[PDB]
Design an enzyme around this catalytic site. Structure first.
Site, mmCIF file in Angstrom:
data_model
loop_
_atom_site.group_PDB
_atom_site.id
_atom_site.type_symbol
_atom_site.label_atom_id
_atom_site.label_comp_id
_atom_site.label_asym_id
_atom_site.label_seq_id
_atom_site.Cartn_x
_atom_site.Cartn_y
_atom_site.Cartn_z
ATOM 1 N N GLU A 179 1.031 -0.774 -0.030
ATOM 2 C CA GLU A 179 -0.458 0.173 0.395
ATOM 3 C C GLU A 179 0.808 0.945 -0.125
ATOM 4 O O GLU A 179 1.337 1.998 1.227
ATOM 5 C CB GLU A 179 -0.911 -0.283 1.281
ATOM 6 C CG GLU A 179 -1.497 1.364 1.171
ATOM 7 C CD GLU A 179 -2.534 1.626 2.710
ATOM 8 O OE1 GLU A 179 -3.245 0.251 3.039
ATOM 9 O OE2 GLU A 179 -3.263 2.260 3.472
ATOM 10 N N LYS A 181 1.567 5.305 -0.025
ATOM 11 C CA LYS A 181 1.559 6.555 0.939
ATOM 12 C C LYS A 181 2.767 7.548 0.452
ATOM 13 O O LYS A 181 4.130 7.208 0.668
ATOM 14 C CB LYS A 181 0.969 6.873 1.797
ATOM 15 C CG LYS A 181 0.309 7.271 2.719
ATOM 16 C CD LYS A 181 -0.296 7.222 4.066
ATOM 17 C CE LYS A 181 -0.804 8.993 4.088
ATOM 18 N NZ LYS A 181 -1.283 8.243 6.067
ATOM 19 N N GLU A 215 -4.619 3.233 -2.554
ATOM 20 C CA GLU A 215 -5.653 4.059 -1.774
ATOM 21 C C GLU A 215 -5.966 5.248 -2.411
ATOM 22 O O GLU A 215 -5.261 6.044 -2.476
ATOM 23 C CB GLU A 215 -5.474 4.198 -0.237
ATOM 24 C CG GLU A 215 -6.498 5.338 0.692
ATOM 25 C CD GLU A 215 -6.494 4.620 2.061
ATOM 26 O OE1 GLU A 215 -6.127 5.687 3.070
ATOM 27 O OE2 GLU A 215 -6.372 3.828 2.561
ATOM 28 N N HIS A 218 -4.528 8.662 -0.891
ATOM 29 C CA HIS A 218 -2.916 8.561 -1.090
ATOM 30 C C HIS A 218 -2.722 9.184 -2.029
ATOM 31 O O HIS A 218 -1.406 9.985 -2.688
ATOM 32 C CB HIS A 218 -2.396 7.229 -0.435
ATOM 33 C CG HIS A 218 -2.614 6.373 1.088
ATOM 34 N ND1 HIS A 218 -2.365 5.807 1.050
ATOM 35 C CD2 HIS A 218 -3.209 7.152 1.949
ATOM 36 C CE1 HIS A 218 -2.851 5.878 2.940
ATOM 37 N NE2 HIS A 218 -3.440 6.718 2.584
ATOM 38 N N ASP A 285 -10.879 2.151 3.642
ATOM 39 C CA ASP A 285 -9.949 2.887 5.240
ATOM 40 C C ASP A 285 -10.402 4.567 4.962
ATOM 41 O O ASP A 285 -9.862 4.616 4.413
ATOM 42 C CB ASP A 285 -8.552 2.592 4.497
ATOM 43 C CG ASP A 285 -7.986 2.991 5.536
ATOM 44 O OD1 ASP A 285 -8.087 3.111 6.583
ATOM 45 O OD2 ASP A 285 -6.475 3.515 5.116
HETATM 46 MG MG MG Z 1 -4.991 2.539 3.758
HETATM 47 MG MG MG Z 2 -4.980 7.254 3.886
#
Ligand code: MG
Ligand code: MG
Ligand code: MG
Ligand code: MG
Ligand code: MG
Ligand code: MG
Ligand code: MG
Ligand code: MG
Lengths: 384, 384, 384, 384
Positions: A179, A181, A215, A218, A285
């Protein structure tokens, strides 16, 4: 617009369970028992829940307390029919991870991070999870000299390779999803976007075991087009999971409910996911704003699913509209899907219509008709 | 701080030659003859120049005018000792490319784009270029329905695969470098960052022929850490070329002279390039501000090279300082470079010091000493 | 959703007339005769048009050509019923303005800028304009030493004070509106946001003559909430005019058609404008994307007005919905509109219920119910 | 570069006292006794400290505990010679303030916020503070319907007017400074920039009592030029206080030590403050990164002051360099400081050299020589 478990909606325990502590304020809500979250989410129409190890079993719990916590959780899953499709490790909350887990400068911390992760992979497999997510929230730096990024990528590759060796040697049917970010809580986080994560995976020893868990918010914290990034992930065959929420531009990670933030990006995302036949969980999320009491938490969770279902209906109506289908041909989306030169290199070189006798001015004068197509998209989104 | 040709500094013709036309204003400077740019850059201490096809041979030029233009250019190179290490195609200025070149919706435009590129690869090889850069400035969209990104990536892969087949079949010793940009002039540009470009390359038929040409300002238009992205490109063995300039944050592409914009990022970039032994050209893709006359153009170009050389000296002094070397050990940069588990998976699993008997609270209490290290870096940068 | 002249929609000549030249590309459309733009806009349902001096009378035109151009324009207005509610000066295109107009370092340029502006105020008044807009697009800097901002603000105040003296001495019934922009084409532009413009106006000699002309995309280029900024402008009584368009986040100024970009911000903007009773023009400062031919230009212009009218309907339905009215009371929007302490300072000090005996924990536990309110807003926007 | 108390450096208790809790992690450092912070800061060379009420007296403290805490604090000030030039209220941490203090929708919360503030104004005056800072961190919204911004500005004006009535009626010699921030922890914060704060102040009943307390990182979270904004605040006579730190672009509020983040912006800030004769405190609102132990906290604090002093030396050398003084004249900074038209409006109108016979092409051809000036600035900053 009522969700059913066949809509594959999932929520993290840490989402509806967020107590509202932010960098400038105390918690505004009491802690939620994971068992109560499972039952409340089941009643809203969710298909399942996800967890970090530390969401379910508080850090430092004895092995006996750990077994009791899992048993209560398993009973709630049995009572509700809820599934656990994804799990992850918390390698960011405890102070020991202040410089990272897999890429902490301290070697003993990196070893501890790997053992903590492996313990939870065993639990995730026991509970039926198909995807194991890694969000390296503490992997990164606030200053330039603190982290040699080449060495850190060596360590990150070493950690993921060891994890792949573990699942292969145990015969587990689980895959990994990274994931990305770009920042927060570190000043810059390693593998900051979908692209960087996809590129990194190709250097792992067993790349087929790893994909991405992008995400919405992000990628938008880098000002990027989230549907574009998802398209590239799908193109690479690497969209193993997805995290849905909302974000208003380049700022701190808001984790708004899905549909909030950039509404038209949410429409084009759902259009893409449904058109591509994405069959994985639709995972939220998100954080219910700390202005909310527990009734607001469930209203925010409900709105995640409602907004997906509304957008799904509108995108389906858009693609099925005969006037949209003609507009797509007017904008030559059909020609975009045709090969440029299936006739091959030498035929292209010999094709005088491709250069010597190509009428550039006639081609340049052809309007793309994109604005009419986009207003049809707007009309359909708004039901106008 | 005087540059020598052995510092490998290069400039595009379109940099010092930029007449100052911006979206809101007319040109403030007259056109520069490429021959005069070569001679003026040679006198400043540059090693060579780069070009787009349309910089050297105006669009639509007859084959006779084309030969005359190349001959004048070649004579200037011979007169000055200047080299041409890199060349590129202009697939963005002419209106025919308004929806892209390699990923235009119109198939005939895509074929024309490929033929225009192939013609310039032949010229670039003739002039001795080792790298061929592709900046897909028009590949992208302003609206969601205008571009199916999966189909567009298919077309982009098809185009680059055909280019690789061409150079392989001709026996050329040239490699390709993709230059990412997140936006401008399209609302979103395909392959928007170094990461996305690196990931895309791994799906090409002959990935060894392709690398990246990252630009300082472009990654900073996404708010990303440019030295971090360069480190990942070096880690992947894909830094074939680099574009140096300055940018003040997330806004339009400023193309300021190198050193301007984020000064400390420029310091950490030079530190990385010199420590990693990057041996490619130090190319400036910058625009002298349109406030400037021609004397200001040469002062801005000179400042590019001066700032690199100042930062090179300061980064070298930083890495050689014994107090910095001790501070790096204090922050455990040495431990970051050591393998996490060269003892292997099963030994890690059996190592009780990695989990069962790991003292997390003692590890958590250890300061990273990053702020002292960063202030030493600041002191060295400032000569304090 | 068909516009009528009573919807007060206006367009700049430079909007539908934009030929598509951007920093990286040539024009994709031929020039539009202002007379043809007036007639085509009239047929779409617009109420009027706006102009820069140089849109109507090309720079350097003889006084005879100037009179002929105005006469043709006036006849088109008479033929169509179109009005000219706003006009502005072009102090940014010609190279003489490369360091600004009112705040150019060169004193002779500043004097020329003022005379050019005064000449067009006379023309604007002749054509019936009620608002005169100033966008200082070249007032600013790319480097720190180039502009002493205190001296530049002195010069900007001097210029606007002189303009106010001019209109007062001539007895004109026209007001000024400053249009802020944070950057582009200068690296940083003076008075970069609505707030800075509002603050500056209060230092002018006759502040009642000056207000703001905020633009959707410009405030969003700073990541700001445009409806919030408009609310502050309305609160100050300074919203004299408004520029409507779309923008996707912090990047170059896109000037997308209104409704594109941040759709929910557009909904909250229309809600505010209609609820506050804003009675000025609804002006579109947008650019039809250069992908478009002339049919796409008119489709894009039509979509500006259509999207306003759709959002106006949905916002009106939102505010009229009894369940929304109850939700607003549930979130205490009614209490926000009540004075905090109309009882006065000493009564507040003596009020033990305000501190000594205030139950903070009971107050803290009250949910704000904002997420339910926002999902009602979402449902209404989407017609769900 | 050793600080002396006459350098007027101040720190908040909450800066070196930050325990390292961020949205994703637990505290990494133990709590600091305010008495120990005063003594450690005194030994580093600081002039004084600042506090929020809740930093010094924990929320809910009995009146007896409050008196004991103040007495211990006062003794530490007496023992060290440290001053308290500024104080502020914490209207953001406690859950009761989750929707704001002065603009909370709940009227009883707004009254409580005012009483909490008034109590601390009395304490601040007792301890000798000259400036009282208000950072409305919770005033704002995450969604559009939650806050009517016009009503909220009415409430904010009401609160500040009541505070001014309080200090006037008590005869206190204290002034107020509003600290803007664009976002975080609210999705959008009211009065998001220096400009919006300056504009708001002009609508207060007694505007002379209110100014701004701008923070480096906050304006940079909107992508704005911080030295430009400070120049406008100085121009308005409203720079009552300033918060110094570092920030790397548009992202979450980093609160890095001063000098980190945008180094050249820090140079131009110090240049401006010293040239303008700013005589207020040089206050650091920074957070030592949570990677650090207590030795790193003091190293980070020391670096704040060191970097200011280094930049002060380099800016002074820049302004005193005769070649810089000649370059400033070459760029016509001298002409920028001269009035455009001290001869008056009618003389400007009659001046044929200002329009009729102005040679625009000769003026346009004059280079501004800004790039040479900026490279002199770079050379001086780097000591090159
Ligand atoms: Mg997430
Ligand atoms: Mg977030
Ligand atoms: Mg660039
Ligand atoms: Mg470049
Ligand atoms: Mg604009
Ligand atoms: Mg405008
Ligand atoms: Mg801050
Ligand atoms: Mg502050």
């Amino acid at each position: 617009y009522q969700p059913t478990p066949e809509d594959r909606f999932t929520f993290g325990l840490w989402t509806v369970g967020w107590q509202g502590r932010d960098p400038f304020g105390d918690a505004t809500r009491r802690a939620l028992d994971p068992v109560e979250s499972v039952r409340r989410l089941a009643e809203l129409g969710a298909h399942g829940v996800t967890f970090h190890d530390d969401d379910l079993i508080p850090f430092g719990s004895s092995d006996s307390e750990r077994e009791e916590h899992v048993k209560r959780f398993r009973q709630a899953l049995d009572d509700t029919g809820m599934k656990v499709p994804m799990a992850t490790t918390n390698l960011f909350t405890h102070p020991v991870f202040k410089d990272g887990g897999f890429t902490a400068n301290d070697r003993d911390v990196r070893r501890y991070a790997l053992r903590k992760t492996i313990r939870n992979i065993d639990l995730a497999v026991e509970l039926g999870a198909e995807t194991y997510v890694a969000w390296g929230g503490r992997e990164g730096a606030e200053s330039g000299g603190a982290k040699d990024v080449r060495d850190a990528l060596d360590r990150m590759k070493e950690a993921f390779d060891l994890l792949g060796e573990y699942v292969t040697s145990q015969g587990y049917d689980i895959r990994f999803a990274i994931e990305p970010k770009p920042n927060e809580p570190r000043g810059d986080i390693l593998l900051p976007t979908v692209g960087h994560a996809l590129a990194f995976i190709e250097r792992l020893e067993r790349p087929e075991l790893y994909g991405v868990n992008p995400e919405v918010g992000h990628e938008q914290m880098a000002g990027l087009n989230f549907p574009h990034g998802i398209a590239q992930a799908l193109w690479a065959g690497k969209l193993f999971h997805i995290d849905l929420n909302g974000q208003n531009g380049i700022k701190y990670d808001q984790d708004l409910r899905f549909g909030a933030g950039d509404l038209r990006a949410a429409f084009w995302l759902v259009d893409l996911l449904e058109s591509a036949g994405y069959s994985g969980p639709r995972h939220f999320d998100f954080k219910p704003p700390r202005t909310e009491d527990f009734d607001g938490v469930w209203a925010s969770a409900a709105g995640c699913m409602r907004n997906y279902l509304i957008l799904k209906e509108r995108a389906a109506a858009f693609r099925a509209d005969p006037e949209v289908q003609e507009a797509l041909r007017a904008s030559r989306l059909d020609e975009l899907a045709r090969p440029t030169a299936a006739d091959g290199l030498q035929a292209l070189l010999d094709d005088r219509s491709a250069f010597e006798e190509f009428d550039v001015d006639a081609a340049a004068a052809r309007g793309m008709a994109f604005e009419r197509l986009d207003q049809l998209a707007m009309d359909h989104l708004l039901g106008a």
